[PDB]
Motif scaffolding. Structure first.
Motif, PDB file in Angstrom:
ATOM      1  N   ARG A   1      -8.138   5.069   1.991  1.00  0.00           N
ATOM      2  CA  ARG A   1      -8.116   5.556   3.372  1.00  0.00           C
ATOM      3  C   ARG A   1      -9.294   4.995   4.171  1.00  0.00           C
ATOM      4  NH1 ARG A   1      -6.867  10.105   0.459  1.00  0.00           N
ATOM      5  NH2 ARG A   1      -8.860  11.102   1.004  1.00  0.00           N
TER       6      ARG A   1
ATOM      7  N   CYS B   1      -9.310  -3.264   0.497  1.00  0.00           N
ATOM      8  CA  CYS B   1      -8.025  -2.612   0.271  1.00  0.00           C
ATOM      9  C   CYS B   1      -7.257  -3.300  -0.850  1.00  0.00           C
ATOM     10  CB  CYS B   1      -7.190  -2.606   1.551  1.00  0.00           C
ATOM     11  SG  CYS B   1      -7.610  -1.370   2.807  1.00  0.00           S
TER      12      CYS B   1
ATOM     13  N   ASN C   1      -6.368  -0.520  14.739  1.00  0.00           N
ATOM     14  CA  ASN C   1      -7.797  -0.784  14.778  1.00  0.00           C
ATOM     15  C   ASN C   1      -8.156  -1.805  15.848  1.00  0.00           C
ATOM     16  OD1 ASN C   1      -8.148   1.043  12.795  1.00  0.00           O
ATOM     17  ND2 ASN C   1      -8.337  -0.431  11.133  1.00  0.00           N
TER      18      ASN C   1
ATOM     19  N   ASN D   1      -0.831   9.542  -4.949  1.00  0.00           N
ATOM     20  CA  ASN D   1      -0.608  10.927  -4.551  1.00  0.00           C
ATOM     21  C   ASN D   1       0.227  11.667  -5.584  1.00  0.00           C
ATOM     22  OD1 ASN D   1      -2.166  10.691  -2.264  1.00  0.00           O
ATOM     23  ND2 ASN D   1      -0.441  10.318  -0.885  1.00  0.00           N
TER      24      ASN D   1
ATOM     25  N   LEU E   1      -8.854   1.224   4.972  1.00  0.00           N
ATOM     26  CA  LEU E   1      -7.930   1.166   6.106  1.00  0.00           C
ATOM     27  C   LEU E   1      -8.625   1.546   7.419  1.00  0.00           C
ATOM     28  CD1 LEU E   1      -4.641   2.796   4.627  1.00  0.00           C
ATOM     29  CD2 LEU E   1      -4.949   0.393   5.289  1.00  0.00           C
ATOM     30  N   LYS E   2      -9.423   2.624   7.407  1.00  0.00           N
ATOM     31  CA  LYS E   2     -10.123   3.087   8.603  1.00  0.00           C
ATOM     32  C   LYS E   2     -11.064   2.015   9.148  1.00  0.00           C
ATOM     33  CE  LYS E   2     -13.529   6.664   9.893  1.00  0.00           C
ATOM     34  NZ  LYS E   2     -14.265   7.893   9.453  1.00  0.00           N
TER      35      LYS E   2
ATOM     36  N   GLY F   1     -10.893  -1.248   8.416  1.00  0.00           N
ATOM     37  CA  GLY F   1     -10.282  -2.563   8.490  1.00  0.00           C
ATOM     38  C   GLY F   1     -10.810  -3.578   7.501  1.00  0.00           C
TER      39      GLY F   1
ATOM     40  N   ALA G   1       3.869   6.144  11.461  1.00  0.00           N
ATOM     41  CA  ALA G   1       3.542   4.727  11.568  1.00  0.00           C
ATOM     42  C   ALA G   1       4.435   4.034  12.594  1.00  0.00           C
ATOM     43  CB  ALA G   1       3.671   4.059  10.200  1.00  0.00           C
TER      44      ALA G   1
ATOM     45  N   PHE H   1      -0.096   4.294  -2.484  1.00  0.00           N
ATOM     46  CA  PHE H   1      -0.388   5.671  -2.099  1.00  0.00           C
ATOM     47  C   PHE H   1       0.576   6.634  -2.778  1.00  0.00           C
ATOM     48  CE2 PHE H   1      -3.095   4.177   1.454  1.00  0.00           C
ATOM     49  CZ  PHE H   1      -4.120   5.097   1.340  1.00  0.00           C
TER      50      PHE H   1
ATOM     51  N   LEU I   1       0.813  -1.212   0.000  1.00  0.00           N
ATOM     52  CA  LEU I   1       0.000   0.000   0.000  1.00  0.00           C
ATOM     53  C   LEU I   1       0.850   1.267   0.000  1.00  0.00           C
ATOM     54  CD1 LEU I   1      -2.912  -0.938   2.395  1.00  0.00           C
ATOM     55  CD2 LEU I   1      -3.034  -0.571  -0.066  1.00  0.00           C
ATOM     56  N   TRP I   2       2.041   1.248   0.618  1.00  0.00           N
ATOM     57  CA  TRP I   2       2.915   2.420   0.536  1.00  0.00           C
ATOM     58  C   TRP I   2       3.169   2.808  -0.921  1.00  0.00           C
ATOM     59  CZ3 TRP I   2       3.144   5.198   4.647  1.00  0.00           C
ATOM     60  CH2 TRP I   2       3.298   4.641   5.930  1.00  0.00           C
TER      61      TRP I   2
ATOM     62  N   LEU J   1       1.840  -1.029   5.745  1.00  0.00           N
ATOM     63  CA  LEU J   1       0.769  -0.093   6.088  1.00  0.00           C
ATOM     64  C   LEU J   1      -0.471  -0.807   6.627  1.00  0.00           C
ATOM     65  CD1 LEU J   1       0.179   2.749   6.415  1.00  0.00           C
ATOM     66  CD2 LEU J   1      -0.539   2.956   4.015  1.00  0.00           C
ATOM     67  N   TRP J   2      -0.891  -1.902   5.985  1.00  0.00           N
ATOM     68  CA  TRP J   2      -2.126  -2.555   6.423  1.00  0.00           C
ATOM     69  C   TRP J   2      -1.971  -3.173   7.810  1.00  0.00           C
ATOM     70  CZ3 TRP J   2      -1.773  -7.557   7.755  1.00  0.00           C
ATOM     71  CH2 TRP J   2      -0.643  -8.244   7.296  1.00  0.00           C
TER      72      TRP J   2
ATOM     73  N   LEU K   1      -2.584   9.298  10.974  1.00  0.00           N
ATOM     74  CA  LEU K   1      -1.960   8.604   9.853  1.00  0.00           C
ATOM     75  C   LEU K   1      -2.827   8.702   8.601  1.00  0.00           C
ATOM     76  CD1 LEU K   1       0.368   6.940   8.821  1.00  0.00           C
ATOM     77  CD2 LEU K   1      -0.633   4.893   9.929  1.00  0.00           C
ATOM     78  N   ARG K   2      -4.159   8.612   8.759  1.00  0.00           N
ATOM     79  CA  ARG K   2      -5.081   8.818   7.633  1.00  0.00           C
ATOM     80  C   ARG K   2      -4.990  10.240   7.080  1.00  0.00           C
ATOM     81  NH1 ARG K   2      -9.894   8.018  10.950  1.00  0.00           N
ATOM     82  NH2 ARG K   2     -10.916   9.342   9.384  1.00  0.00           N
TER      83      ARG K   2
ATOM     84  N   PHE L   1      -2.411  -0.451  10.455  1.00  0.00           N
ATOM     85  CA  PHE L   1      -3.814  -0.192  10.722  1.00  0.00           C
ATOM     86  C   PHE L   1      -4.476  -1.351  11.427  1.00  0.00           C
ATOM     87  CE2 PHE L   1      -3.378   3.535   8.160  1.00  0.00           C
ATOM     88  CZ  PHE L   1      -4.238   4.388   8.800  1.00  0.00           C
TER      89      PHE L   1
ATOM     90  N   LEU M   1      -1.713  10.427   5.183  1.00  0.00           N
ATOM     91  CA  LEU M   1      -1.776   9.800   3.864  1.00  0.00           C
ATOM     92  C   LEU M   1      -2.520  10.687   2.875  1.00  0.00           C
ATOM     93  CD1 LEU M   1      -2.564   6.157   4.978  1.00  0.00           C
ATOM     94  CD2 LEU M   1      -0.517   6.933   3.799  1.00  0.00           C
TER      95      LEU M   1
ATOM     96  N   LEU N   1      -9.712  -5.250   4.770  1.00  0.00           N
ATOM     97  CA  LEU N   1      -8.495  -5.523   4.011  1.00  0.00           C
ATOM     98  C   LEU N   1      -8.773  -6.226   2.688  1.00  0.00           C
ATOM     99  CD1 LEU N   1      -5.769  -6.503   6.664  1.00  0.00           C
ATOM    100  CD2 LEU N   1      -6.439  -4.235   5.791  1.00  0.00           C
TER     101      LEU N   1
END
Lengths: 55, 55
Positions: A29, A40, B10, A10, A32-33, A35, B44, A6, A2-3, B2-3, B28-29, B6, B32, A37
């Motif tokens: 985002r 994701c 979480n 970005n 991730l918030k 969970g 992180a 992003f 995911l790094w 990253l996952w 962190l959100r 979280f 990102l 996955l």
């Protein structure tokens, strides 16, 4: 990774302001918030294919 | 990774309601979203440090 995803999204947003890059980044985002996955991973693959199609 | 960051935040939020975990995850959100990935990575590592100190 995911790094890396992003980073690519970005960079896209920064250079072109692409709405689809913005939407995909926002969706990552959230997954991730919350969970989710599974989402994701799918969103990441979706994001990669889209960046490839821009190039 | 990253996952996994979280996942750990979480789980901390969900299981203990810890406010620092909640603030780390939100930050962190937001990091990102701004796209300073060097900074998001430093944040992180601070998250993982805090979670380890809870154990």
């Amino acid at each position: 990774p995911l790094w890396q995803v992003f980073y690519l999204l970005n960079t896209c947003i920064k250079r072109t302001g692409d709405p689809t890059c913005k939407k995909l980044a926002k969706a990552l985002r959230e997954c991730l918030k919350k969970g989710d996955l599974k989402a994701c991973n799918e969103l990441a693959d979706k994001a990669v294919k889209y960046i490839n199609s821009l190039e």
